[PDB]
């Protein structure tokens, strides 16, 4: 096969110029997102519920074979998970 992609991608163009596409958005469009987020009311509360469902319950870090990593970090042992 090959060591670099040989199919093209649509994702090249005249930068943040006057054309319209989902990857071609301007700083004004970015500030439009910020305005929807800032301004509160029912729309902001729904998208906050979406963030809380996806990410609000917290997290855990695992390493496969963590105990085998055990090494002195600063005169005391840690595993990579502990670090």
Q: Whose Cβ is closer to other proteins: residue 12's or residue 72's?
A: 12
- Rounded Cα–Cα distance for residues 55 and 48 (Å): 10
Q: Is 14 in the site for other proteins (CB under 8 A)?
A: yes
Q: Whose Cβ is closer to other proteins: residue 8's or residue 54's?
A: 8
Q: How far is the CB of 46 from other proteins (least distance, A)?
A: 23
Residue keyed to tokens 């090249």: 12
Q: Is 54 in the site for other proteins (CB under 8 A)?
A: no
Q: What is each CA distance from 49 to 41, 44, 46, 55, in whole angstroms? A: 13, 9, 5, 10
């Amino acid at each position: 096969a090959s060591s670099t992609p040989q199919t093209n991608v649509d994702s090249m163009g005249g930068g943040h110029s006057y054309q319209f596409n989902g990857q071609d958005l301007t700083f004004e469009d970015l500030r439009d997102i910020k305005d929807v987020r800032d301004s509160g009311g029912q729309v902001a509360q729904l998208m906050d519920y979406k963030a809380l469902l996806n990410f609000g319950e917290g997290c855990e870090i695992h390493v496969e074979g963590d105990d085998e990593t055990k090494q002195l970090v600063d005169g005391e042992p840690m595993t990579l998970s502990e670090w």
